[PDB]
Design a protein around this ligand. Structure first.
Ligand SMILES: Cc1cc2nc3c(=O)[nH]c(=O)nc-3n(C[C@H](O)[C@H](O)[C@H](O)COP(=O)(O)OP(=O)(O)OC[C@H]3O[C@@H](n4cnc5c(N)ncnc54)[C@H](O)[C@@H]3O)c2cc1C
Ligand SMILES: Cc1cc2nc3c(=O)[nH]c(=O)nc-3n(C[C@H](O)[C@H](O)[C@H](O)COP(=O)(O)OP(=O)(O)OC[C@H]3O[C@@H](n4cnc5c(N)ncnc54)[C@H](O)[C@@H]3O)c2cc1C
Ligand SMILES: Cc1cc2nc3c(=O)[nH]c(=O)nc-3n(C[C@H](O)[C@H](O)[C@H](O)COP(=O)(O)OP(=O)(O)OC[C@H]3O[C@@H](n4cnc5c(N)ncnc54)[C@H](O)[C@@H]3O)c2cc1C
Ligand SMILES: Cc1cc2nc3c(=O)[nH]c(=O)nc-3n(C[C@H](O)[C@H](O)[C@H](O)COP(=O)(O)OP(=O)(O)OC[C@H]3O[C@@H](n4cnc5c(N)ncnc54)[C@H](O)[C@@H]3O)c2cc1C
Ligand SMILES: Cc1cc2nc3c(=O)[nH]c(=O)nc-3n(C[C@H](O)[C@H](O)[C@H](O)COP(=O)(O)OP(=O)(O)OC[C@H]3O[C@@H](n4cnc5c(N)ncnc54)[C@H](O)[C@@H]3O)c2cc1C
Ligand SMILES: Cc1cc2nc3c(=O)[nH]c(=O)nc-3n(C[C@H](O)[C@H](O)[C@H](O)COP(=O)(O)OP(=O)(O)OC[C@H]3O[C@@H](n4cnc5c(N)ncnc54)[C@H](O)[C@@H]3O)c2cc1C
Ligand SMILES: [Cl-]
Ligand SMILES: [Cl-]
Ligand SMILES: [Cl-]
Ligand SMILES: [Cl-]
Ligand SMILES: [Mg+2]
Ligand SMILES: [Mg+2]
Ligand SMILES: [Mg+2]
Ligand SMILES: [Mg+2]
Ligand SMILES: [Mg+2]
Ligand SMILES: [Mg+2]
Ligand SMILES: [Mg+2]
Ligand SMILES: [Mg+2]
Ligand SMILES: [Mg+2]
Ligand SMILES: [Mg+2]
Ligand SMILES: [Mg+2]
Ligand SMILES: [Mg+2]
Ligand SMILES: [Mg+2]
Ligand SMILES: [Mg+2]
Ligand SMILES: [Mg+2]
Ligand SMILES: [Mg+2]
Ligand SMILES: [Mg+2]
Ligand SMILES: [Mg+2]
Ligand SMILES: [Mg+2]
Ligand SMILES: [Mg+2]
Ligand SMILES: [Mg+2]
Ligand SMILES: [Mg+2]
Ligand SMILES: [Mg+2]
Ligand SMILES: [Mg+2]
Ligand code: NA
Ligand code: NA
Ligand code: NA
Ligand code: NA
Lengths: 64, 64, 64, 64, 64, 64, 64, 64, 64, 64, 64, 64
């Protein structure tokens, strides 16, 4: 059985790096992370100093 | 990194109040709730005494 | 077996009241209305005197 | 010919009032606003003092 | 308030059995599981010995 | 001209059998049922004794 | 309150004429037909002698 | 850089002519119109004398 | 078993004729073409002399 | 690099068996079939003797 | 009130840089640009010398 | 007439490079590749040594 968590990673560099930011976080606290699906991408301009790329991913991990 | 939880709030008053019901629950148990996105709305008629408005939200909270 | 009818309710007050308008109509002529799903919301401005909120719902009712 | 502008209204009261906020703005600067379609709804929790309901609408207006 | 978890069940028999696999897992660790919504179905052919049917479900459970 | 009715069939056995449940109902009361399109599938767990698979279908029938 | 019926019109001439075919049928049996929304278009090639254009429409009519 | 404007053209003749109506309007006031994407089609029956076909298009034009 | 190919036909006349352009091409090289589903429509304005209507279709053909 | 082909399998038994029908066909003529994604399911009632379940799948295979 | 403009940026380097191209253009002519949402990405191969990555974004800016 | 093939490219570097991987493959075996549309992006974590970015594209090529 796989379970997914819906995480939004951020990066001042790229959409790929923002995806990696989310996946890194998942791998910090979950075992057996197996894949991630991009579900949205955006750029924060107003709330930050430099543009921040955001990539939202469903991160899948195997239960048990 | 933000994480989202998918909650369905309920209210006998309104779709806005049902959204608030879900968000209140998130704020009870999570720190740093930052935003919510409505993903569905419905009305339960059969299983309840009065019509109950339901608003499903992705509630986003900042990790760490 | 459930069947759905696709109704658009209207209200000069709110999206929730427009949903109720459709559901009330369904309950007038159908037995065993069990739930409604919101599928669209809009506001008529041009064809009416006051703004009219419209909420389109699939209203589900149990057959037999 | 109709044209649409994509506006996000805000309200500390309700999703309907947030829709009205956007429509009011359109009517301030455009002639012949005819209808609005809801395309998204959300709640800002982090960037504001009280929860702020947001309703994004395509507001249609007749050209000429 | 309902919460949903996004689980992918697997079965060498059928899409229905893969849905059951996910739901069984949810019921092992959660109280008050109330419904599940199918959101995707697929078949793993390469990574497995026999074809494995996968059914991804949002499993809803009542909080409190 | 074809017309569609939106029916949700139910079965304690399978998603296919739930689709058949809806189609059987359509064929009971309609002439010239020609095809059905699956639009959603779900599982009721809370309101029933055994899990009940539900398959929502648009059932198309030829008018005249 | 508006209600919609989901009809597929057909024509050996054009997608517009197939839409008209469905709308004509609705107007034959319903009062107060007000608008139609195209939801799908297709072409039957195998089951017919000449290509037949099909346009599926939600046809809206005012109740009461 | 391309920008898009969301226009709904109308015609008493056809969906293609309604698309042309919107595109003609764009070309009246914009330079360097490059393409249009159909995003919706509908038919007004109630508010008009003859049926009026409507085709909503994103019309893209090159900036600078 | 049916297979689909995703083709974009073009016409200086109409969306229906652009669909026919794609279907004609499929019928030139494939046996047992059975149906086509419209998946997108657009208009090329910049790259061509006269406006060119484009209709993208999934064209289905029976294998064997 | 993976490539996908869009196949509709058929079965008089079940949606799972219809998916298998498509996948079997892919495996007959393609090497390195790795996974399949369900994209639609339907039931043919009019054109056949017994109901025929159809499951449309994107079947992925590794190139080279 | 926020308003969105739908811009397609281009880059011979990356999807992120194409998003930046659109956002830069928005910031040239608009005050109070606050965020951007990616809505499509593509690659032009035929009309250009080197591959050109395109990223279409809704760019949001605060009115007043 | 354009035809599309649905390819998933892979890269240990970026989503853009994974898109390029698919497009390169198309250009190896097809003439007159004209554009590509991104339809999905993901990251393989479990089946590989380093994270592998995957970008699925519809690659369009002109027939004849
Ligand atoms: C519906 C909604 C969605 C949001 N999505 C994001 C997001 O993906 N990433 C992010 O950093 N912040 C997002 N925010 C803003 C976030 O809540 C904080 O305001 C911000 O991060 C500073 O705290 C204000 N606002 C309204 N809609 C948006 C939006 N789509 N994006 C940004 N601001 C908005 C969103 C806000 C709302 C209301
Ligand atoms: C529905 C489905 C979709 C898949 N999509 C991809 C893909 O885009 N790229 C890829 O490398 N492999 C994918 N795979 C896995 C692939 O089949 C092989 O297992 C893997 O590449 C090793 O061989 C196991 N599994 C179930 N769902 C997924 C999923 N979405 N992604 C990965 N594993 C899954 C998918 C598998 C399935 C069942
Ligand atoms: C696919 C599915 C979705 C559901 N969604 C909701 C929901 O959003 N809110 C809610 O209160 N209950 C929902 N229910 C019903 C819920 O499971 C309980 O039956 C009810 O709350 C009493 O316990 C019975 N049934 C089938 N489909 C539905 C449906 N869409 N809504 C209601 N009943 C249905 C759903 C049931 C199913 C099978
Ligand atoms: C495709 C389409 C959809 C419509 N949807 C609605 C609706 O949801 N509610 C409603 O009151 N009227 C709607 N109308 C208008 C309706 O037909 C009548 O013109 C109006 O109610 C007065 O009679 C003119 N027109 C074109 N598109 C629209 C639109 N989306 N909304 C309004 N006018 C439009 C729609 C019209 C069309 C052509
Ligand atoms: C529906 C449609 C969408 C288009 N989208 C884009 C785009 O996103 N970016 C871009 O540079 N040009 C696009 N074009 C092409 C553009 O109009 C010019 O032909 C090109 O940029 C040279 O001038 C020819 N054609 C048909 N469909 C497409 C397509 N999806 N992409 C490219 N060519 C197509 C599109 C054309 C059409 C008809
Ligand atoms: C899911 C599904 C959808 C269909 N949609 C249509 C339609 O829109 N118009 C129509 O004339 N007939 C359609 N048919 C076929 C119809 O049922 C009859 O076979 C035909 O009209 C002759 O009787 C066989 N088959 C499987 N999928 C399709 C499909 N999408 N279109 C055609 N044949 C298919 C559909 C069949 C199925 C199974
Ligand atoms: Cl989710
Ligand atoms: Cl419907
Ligand atoms: Cl838009
Ligand atoms: Cl495809
Ligand atoms: Mg930096
Ligand atoms: Mg988002
Ligand atoms: Mg009360
Ligand atoms: Mg729901
Ligand atoms: Mg009042
Ligand atoms: Mg609507
Ligand atoms: Mg207040
Ligand atoms: Mg939004
Ligand atoms: Mg077995
Ligand atoms: Mg999936
Ligand atoms: Mg049993
Ligand atoms: Mg449902
Ligand atoms: Mg003729
Ligand atoms: Mg169809
Ligand atoms: Mg005329
Ligand atoms: Mg519309
Ligand atoms: Mg001509
Ligand atoms: Mg297209
Ligand atoms: Mg049998
Ligand atoms: Mg289909
Ligand atoms: Mg360079
Ligand atoms: Mg695009
Ligand atoms: Mg490397
Ligand atoms: Mg994918
Ligand atoms: Na989730
Ligand atoms: Na319906
Ligand atoms: Na717009
Ligand atoms: Na394809």
């Amino acid at each position: 059985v796989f379970k997914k968590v819906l995480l939004t990673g951020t990066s001042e560099e790229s959409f790929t790096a923002a995806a990696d930011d989310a996946i890194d976080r998942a791998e910090d606290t979950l075992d057996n992370v197996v894949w991630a699906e991009v579900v949205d991408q955006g750029v924060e301009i107003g709330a930050v100093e430099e543009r921040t790329y955001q990539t939202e991913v469903q991160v899948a991990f195997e239960l048990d």
